[PDB]
Symmetry: C3
Subunit: 317 residues, 3 copies
């Protein structure tokens, strides 16, 4: 099918952690950017308008651009950048399946490293693995890092000389993340993305993960893990069988990443919360103001298209 | 079987490197903590007494906690912390096989990153791989990193603003590590653990490693490597066929990790020493005061239980 | 067959990036060091002369040194170092196949980390994989990092306290790297090496890579990837089918590594340029002074032995 989307690039501020507000260049004014969910073989058209003060592009990571290399989104290689206030149209066929993503390719150390210019691109295979057909919940986890010294000033950041002192999944640091709520018998697909500049050792308590896909393509030899290392650019898809009711934390195991501004706890932490488990008065997330779409799991059920999410939206000046 | 162990948490000082003594919270007053070795299906009970000034827990990494999530050891999620002076009992069924480990889950960046709050938990499958059948020596290597500026002071460390400037296997930096002594024909299983917050590229000279297990679970497609990357939380099990007599160094290949306080050599370095190879006058470890249990290889032959090691104990 | 050659160690200066000249200890005065290309089973003899002011060795990473451990190149373990002005001969049998490498094993954090003391050692298997027999272009990519503060300062660098601020493939930072020029229907073998102290996430636009070998040994279960993580000491071999004409960048995806002294772009970046794609006036490499051997692809076709490359030579 032909699927055409209109996207903008916006200057907004997001709250990453308690007391860390961050200036970002959010696709449609949000970080992570909108989910794009299409089927293998679709013809995708994305019309991009740059409503920011700086040039950008969009590169479609994992899209082969078969005969469409001029839509690869690389400044000085496949296009000139999209200048401030201008527009540009990308066209490609989604012939590469799986968990893909998209991100700016201008000034990437800063724009991708700390300005939130990235989002997920999910291409459904026409022939999914049998296990993918058992899945009852699909979960996107995009990990990145943040340098508080440059929170308030575009044009700086993302170098070896900066200090990454805050860490997130889907642009929030615990306790501002949200739980992953399941019930016994769920079959959970988790898609990990190395969206920023860090390495993240994602560990699920209470469960092993079956690693089924690397960079969106299915492994001939899937393997179990309780800790999956995710580095910049990579994606891993795993399956968790939710057959062990409890409250089981699920987090980056890199010790300095479970901090926020030098304080603990913080960072890319969630909890696999099973519906049937009674809640204790001392539970950190008792009475959480819950967002069921923090991992895009509701949008992923709503058919093909492009989906914004207000839990990811920042504030305009 | 039901296996019941009593553990304490102690404030002790260990010698990590020449030039670096470090204040740690040692399980049974040692770093690495005691080896816990049990069989698949056993009912484990661990009674923990906190003889320190700060709260702690123990999380059993890789243990599913099937029917027992209140023993997972996560403060504010599965329990309230074990306060100073207090005790607490963990109970779980060891239904998950392989190389597991345990560690504090309070203030983890500091307590696991630099205060030594970790140890190995080995669960033997009731049905081991065929390769495991041939093994003649089992070896534990737990890698971690240290920040000298906070060596003397609990309550600081383990953040991106600190500097990790010493590196170890089993809480020693070369030359205070120990050789891995083998004889021709040994079949050596090595279990690597990313115990601290660093990444470690473990490279064996003279030999390839057959990577057989990830996080304790056997791979359907094992693969050879001469360098195995180990990151925080992970375990890898390998097999080395000791069929090449010599002295072969075995170390983290991350360049800055073979330093100690800015000087080289240091860090996670051992030597695979084969019995019978003549020792040269200039060999760095000629006359080493040898510890045959530095990798827990003697304790791993002693059956199921909880095993302390005097060479890992710290001082009060 | 017996393969004998002579290597020196030289104090030279190379250009890593615009504005950054770097003092190195180059094998045969070049960085990367000379390519050594042999066949499985060859007997290798390397006569080394140290024409520098400091001691060095050469370790042959991946070479088992079966019955020849005294040629492993480890100071204080298998030999005394090669002092300034002295010479030393290595002898070993190349019975381990695939993508190997060699590097100094003295003061490794500095000498390997920032002084360029490394090069590639390719051992052709008697029985290549079927896909290897289809290869039309063989490509070596050795990644490393540089600390500009110690560019002029032998005896310094390579510690946690230093800052790696420049990044390269084959000792150049973009734009001083070279394009990977292909034609439609090429079958490209790329060998990635973690030569320095960094981690590199190598991502090919426009193409998936088939990962076929880890540390030179063929995987029983190869797998596709668009991003391959390469850490110190490791090698990965991949295949790209060049069936998608365009200009497709190919680079380290670690965000801080596509910088040079804090400026962007820089770092380990190339472009897969297909023959016959029209060139826009804004293409960054439209006027490139092209070196077809920047990835050793021409040397790899010229027989068994040791190959220097003038584009990698430094100045005395
Ligand atoms: Cl439930
Ligand atoms: Cu941008
Ligand atoms: Cu990308
Ligand atoms: Cu890409
Ligand atoms: Cu945990
Ligand atoms: Cu603790
Ligand atoms: Cu853990
Ligand atoms: Cu755990
Ligand atoms: Cu070595
Ligand atoms: Cu040297
Ligand atoms: Cu090496
Ligand atoms: Cu080696
Ligand atoms: Cu790119």
């Amino acid at each position: 099918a032909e699927r055409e989307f209109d996207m903008t690039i916006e200057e907004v501020t997001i709250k990453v952690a308690p007391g860390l507000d961050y200036k970002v260049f959010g696709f449609n004014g949000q970080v992570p950017g909108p989910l794009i969910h299409v089927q293998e073989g679709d013809d995708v058209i994305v019309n991009v308008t740059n409503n920011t003060s700086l040039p950008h592009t969009i590169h479609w990571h994992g899209v082969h651009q078969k005969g469409t290399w001029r839509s690869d989104g690389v400044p000085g290689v496949t296009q000139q950048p999209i200048e401030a206030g201008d527009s540009y149209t990308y066209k490609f066929k989604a012939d590469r399946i799986g968990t893909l993503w998209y991100h700016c390719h201008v000034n990437v150390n800063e724009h991708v490293g700390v300005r939130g210019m990235w989002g997920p691109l999910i291409v459904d295979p026409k022939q999914p693995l049998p296990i993918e057909k058992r899945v009852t919940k699909d979960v996107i986890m995009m990990m990145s890092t943040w340098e508080s010294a440059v929170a308030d000033k575009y044009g700086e950041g993302g170098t070896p000389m900066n200090v990454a002192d805050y860490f997130s999944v889907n642009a929030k640091s615990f306790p501002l993340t949200q739980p992953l709520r399941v019930k016994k018998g769920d079959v959970v697909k988790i898609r990990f993305f190395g969206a920023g500049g860090g390495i993240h050792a994602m560990h699920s308590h209470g469960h092993d993960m079956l690693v089924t896909h690397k960079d969106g393509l299915p492994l001939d030899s899937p393997y179990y893990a309780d800790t999956v290392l995710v580095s910049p650019g990579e994606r891993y898809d795993v399956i968790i069988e939710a057959d062990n009711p409890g409250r089981f934390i699920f987090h980056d195991h890199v010790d300095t990443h479970v901090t926020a501004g030098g304080k603990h706890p913080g960072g890319p932490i969630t909890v696999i919360e099973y519906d049937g488990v009674p809640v204790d008065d001392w539970y950190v997330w008792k009475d959480k103001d819950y967002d069921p779409n923090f991992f895009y799991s509701e949008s992923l059920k709503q058919g093909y298209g492009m989906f914004d999410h207000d839990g990811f939206k920042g504030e305009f000046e």
